[PDB]
Design a protein that fits this description.
183 residues; mainly beta; 2 helices; Kiwellin-like; hydroxylation; secreted; allergen; disulfide bond
Length: 183
């Protein structure tokens, strides 16, 4: 491996080249600028402040698998509600008797899962199928336009009343652990 190229755990690679990240960048004390100009963990992109708190922001979410761990929260998708306007996938409002969810920005993946069903499993072993209709935005929040609410976390399935009920869960606990997959 040279410049845009990967070392193992340690710097088992070409020339007098060391390991920065998982790539063979240059050694600073050597003074050689061989890999100059070349470039290469879901982590927070930064923070937004509201109230007092700093809240992390994210562009990404953990990897989607056949059994993806997540936190389930509760959201009002109706025209009456909390959200800033219509759901992203279809520019409409929905009833909270519909089995529907929003997904953290990374899982939302620019709309690639809109209109798809996911299967959510709770800790009591109940499962429910729900349609993806919206993004739980983990990049933006804490302002006029979002009602001063923090940005979403990165591992969130934000479910309707009907999703919580189908799962036998009390929405007043606010947040519970689940797993999910495409259905």
């Amino acid at each position: 491996s040279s410049c845009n190229g990967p070392c193992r755990d340690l710097n088992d690679c070409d020339g007098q080249l060391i390991c920065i990240k998982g790539k063979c960048n240059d050694d600073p004390q050597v003074g050689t600028h061989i890999c100059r100009g070349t470039t290469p963990g879901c982590k927070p992109s930064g923070t937004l402040t509201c109230r007092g708190k700093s809240h992390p922001t994210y562009d990404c979410s953990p990897p989607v698998t056949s059994s993806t761990p997540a936190k389930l929260t509760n959201n009002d998708f109706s025209e009456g509600g909390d959200d800033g306007g219509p759901s992203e996938c279809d520019e409409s409002y929905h009833n909270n008797n519909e089995r529907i969810v929003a997904l953290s920005t990374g899982w939302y993946n620019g709309g690639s899962r809109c209109g798809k069903m996911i299967r959510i499993t709770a800790s009591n072993g109940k499962s429910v199928s729900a349609k993806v209709v919206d993004e739980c935005d983990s990049r933006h929040g804490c302002d006029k336009e979002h009602a001063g609410q923090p940005p979403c976390r990165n591992n969130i399935v934000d479910g309707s009343n009907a999703v919580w009920s189908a799962l036998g869960l009390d929405k007043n606990v606010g947040v519970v652990d689940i797993t999910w997959s495409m259905a």
